Amino acid sequence: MGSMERASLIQKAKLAEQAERYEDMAAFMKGAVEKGEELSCEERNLLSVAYKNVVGGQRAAWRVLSSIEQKSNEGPEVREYREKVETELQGVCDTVLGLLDSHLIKEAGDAESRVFYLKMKGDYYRYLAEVATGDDKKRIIDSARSAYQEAMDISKKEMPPTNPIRLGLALNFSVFHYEIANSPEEAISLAKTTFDEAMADLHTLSEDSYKDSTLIMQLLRDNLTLWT
């Protein structure tokens, strides 16, 4: 997207979101990142929404195909096609991780941007871990853990307990513990402590911030209900 203006890329990313054209959205936001300027709060959300939708569809397809493949192991086509989808998913994750590494994270100095990008890094390594089976699943898991942990450390020092980025980070890190790291007790403890500390901070918030925070706290509660 080298020949398109940064502002035009951002504008078209917003149009693509309205049209539910998430592959286009991601390509526009990739082009905007590669302009080399830092991203605003809104622009970070556009980047995240775009790739989350793209990889979300790939993950859903991979799970359908992985399930069919497992039922068959109780021609090569099902394995071959699952492998095709898996490779495409890995390529998208690698692309996002490449954007974070070149050079979003190193230029992110404010807590809001740095925690946002590191949560992103944890998420896309988590997606790689979901399909990993070889000699590097352990290394991929530790890469996810390390990103989430650095983001947690910053968010606990620099953000209030009700901050939606801090809450969503804790939510996804708890899902990492439960689903990836085989640490359901750590997952439950993190979700509980996150929820309780947010509840105690709600009195400080405006009506609109209250709605933002309580929405994510309900997601923590939904998981705790499923896990206990």
């Binding site: 939510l171 996804n172 899902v175």
Partner: peptide
Amino acid sequence: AGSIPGRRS
């Protein structure tokens, strides 16, 4: 177990 939906913004 639900992660952040993050599909709309």
